[PDB]
Write a protein that binds this ligand. Structure first.
Ligand SMILES: Nc1ncnc2c1ncn2[C@@H]1O[C@H](COP(=O)(O)OP(=O)(O)OP(=O)(O)O)[C@@H](O)[C@H]1O
Ligand SMILES: Nc1ncnc2c1ncn2[C@@H]1O[C@H](COP(=O)(O)OP(=O)(O)O)[C@@H](O)[C@H]1O
Ligand SMILES: [Mg+2]
Ligand SMILES: [Mg+2]
Lengths: 242, 296
């Protein structure tokens, strides 16, 4: 079926008491294949990825991981950073390939920000060290992803603290450039809805549960109201979303 | 007393050794005691300031080049604006251009090493600093929330009724999920805001900016995190409600700031363009028009 993440009917929660956070999540994520999660604010977008890691508590439901669980790459909504060098951040206990490291820092376009740093590559950034921008920290924390040969990338939102130029450099190069080279399963949360043409599967979720999952033609045909809300919301209302 | 010598010589030298080790903490706290002040008392006397100091925000920028530190370059170049009291200003630009440097120039944290800049006629740099940062309002890209409770995190100065707080939850579109919290008000926001979402943390910070009733709210990229539907809905809500207020907006997305009055474009620390968004979109060679075109 070529499907690595097969969470069926999960009534997941954060707190062990109270109401559950998630309810009846019947999702599928295809292998080698980019998908996108779009929901509203506070509505389960990080919670699906942390339930898929099993960090959130399973009251009911069942998770059907396939190649226990392998090592996944992950970059959170808040960028966690070490007190190491920038190269030791981006490698993160891997073997250092110079050309794979070179195409990651060319793919992220962190090269002028590593050019303006006073030791360049080996500056000890972090808490003990130089404070950063936050956007540069976001690019460093996603630059530690897509390197590990880990084949599942849990890429929570990179496109908060970046502009349109660096997000098109992150969305044409990098995402769908080197992640179409090997068959790495990339999942994204993104409210910049211009990249909704650059998605094969699409998860749309609403208030704990999902609304539907499937492709853009399936949301065009079957859903066709949140599709119209995305058509008004992206403001290319003349064209047809494909 | 020879037996007193052989029982107390060790406590003499061991108490000398950890006396040196504990007095290193006095040396460290006296080295950190001698830090630099910010000089919170200003040049101008606190009697020319009225009750409504920023009643009509005439932000006249003249030749304002700023600097973060003494060793660094001038980040912003020689810029000029004439900002009306009913105006709404959208500032767009690249990362690394200086647009969130320019929002800190109103609050005197980034050092204005040359420049005239005023609001309502009278100089920003010749002001008391606490009366400057008390009667003005910012909102940042970072959501920083403290521990304790929600009425403290929206009102730490304790002086407000619950109706203006729930009016701020009404104009954040936050009221429905704060009513879905099981206290109504007065539940627990944890250390850094880890009880909620990142967009909900930024919505709490937005509503904490909405409690204060000053006529200047300035806005950094708050809706970088919060999604496009609530960006449209919240942009419509803050454009209808705060009609008097001179709102300066570093918008993260350009398609929420097509409804602005006039637009600053900042590229490499300088104003490239300053006109109508219809004029700068219809010029077709302009970098604001390629910011609209590169988005959609
Ligand atoms: N760490 C947590 N502990 C307890 N409750 C949480 C936690 N994180 C989220 N919640 C609750 O679960 C719900 C889901 O929030 P979540 O963090 O999934 O938002 P999100 O939709 O991922 O945010 P964004 O819109 O930024 O993507 C929220 O209503 C929040 O109150
Ligand atoms: N804390 C800081 N200390 C020194 N320089 C800074 C600091 N923050 C930003 N800068 C410099 O100022 C320039 C503009 O930064 P900033 O205005 O913060 O971001 P943006 O241009 O994305 O709004 C950047 O090129 C950066 O090098
Ligand atoms: Mg989230
Ligand atoms: Mg900035």
């Amino acid at each position: 079926d070529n499907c690595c993440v097969q969470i069926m009917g999960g009534y997941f929660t954060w707190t062990p008491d109270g109401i559950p956070t998630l309810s009846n999540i019947t999702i599928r994520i295809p292998r080698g294949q980019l998908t996108m999660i779009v929901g509203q604010v506070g509505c389960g977008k990080s919670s699906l990825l942390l339930a898929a890691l099993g960090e959130m508590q399973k009251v009911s439901g069942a998770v059907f991981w396939s190649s226990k669980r392998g090592p996944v790459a992950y970059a959170s909504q808040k960028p966690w950073l070490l007190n190491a060098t920038v190269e030791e951040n981006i490698i993160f206990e891997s073997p250092f390939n110079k050309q794979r490291y070179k195409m990651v820092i060319e793919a992220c376009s962190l090269q002028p920000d590593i050019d303006i740093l006073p030791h360049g590559d080996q500056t000890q950034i972090g808490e003990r060290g130089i404070n950063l921008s936050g956007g540069q920290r976001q690019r460093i924390s996603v630059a530690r992803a897509l390197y590990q040969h880990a084949n599942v990338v849990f890429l929570d939102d990179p496109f908060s603290a970046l502009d349109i130029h660096l997000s098109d450099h992150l969305m044409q190069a990098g995402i769908l450039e080197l992640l179409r080279d090997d068959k790495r399963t990339v999942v994204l949360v993104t409210h910049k809805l211009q990249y909704l043409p650059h998605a094969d599967w699409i998860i749309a979720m609403k208030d704990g549960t999902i609304q539907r999952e499937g492709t853009l033609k399936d949301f065009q045909r079957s859903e066709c109201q949140l599709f119209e809300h995305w058509k008004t919301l992206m403001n290319r209302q003349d064209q047809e979303l494909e | 007393y020879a037996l007193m010598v052989s029982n107390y010589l060790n406590w003499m030298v061991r108490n000398l050794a950890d006396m040196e080790l504990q007095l290193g903490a006095v040396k460290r706290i006296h080295g950190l005691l001698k830090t630099e002040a910010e000089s919170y008392e200003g040049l101008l006397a606190p009697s020319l300031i009225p009750k409504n100091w920023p009643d009509q925000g005439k932000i006249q920028i003249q030749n304002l080049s700023v600097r973060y530190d003494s060793s660094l370059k001038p980040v912003l170049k020689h810029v000029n604006a004439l900002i009306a009291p009913g105006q709404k200003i959208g500032i767009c630009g690249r990362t690394g251009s200086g647009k969130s440097s320019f929002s800190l120039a109103f609050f005197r944290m980034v050092d204005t090493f040359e420049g005239h800049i005023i609001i309502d006629g009278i100089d920003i740099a010749k002001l008391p600093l606490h009366t400057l940062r008390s009667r003005l309002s910012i909102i940042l890209q970072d959501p920083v929330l403290f521990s304790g409770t929600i009425r403290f995190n929206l009102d730490p100065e304790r002086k407000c009724s619950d109706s203006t707080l729930w009016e701020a939850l009404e104009i954040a579109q936050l009221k429905l999920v704060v009513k879905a919290l099981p206290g109504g008000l007065d539940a627990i926001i944890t250390e850094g805001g880890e009880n909620f979402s990142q967009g909900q943390r930024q919505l709490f910070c937005l509503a904490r900016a909405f409690v204060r009733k000053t006529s200047i709210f300035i806005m950094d990229e708050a809706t970088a995190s919060i999604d496009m539907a609530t960006e449209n809905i919240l942009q419509k809500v803050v454009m209808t409600a705060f009609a008097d207020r001179t709102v300066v907006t570093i918008a993260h997305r350009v398609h929420t700031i097509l409804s602005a009055d006039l637009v600053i474009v900042l590229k490499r620390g300088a104003i490239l363009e300053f006109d109508k968004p219809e004029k700068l979109l219809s010029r077709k060679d302009s970098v604001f028009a390629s910011f609209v075109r590169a988005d959609k």
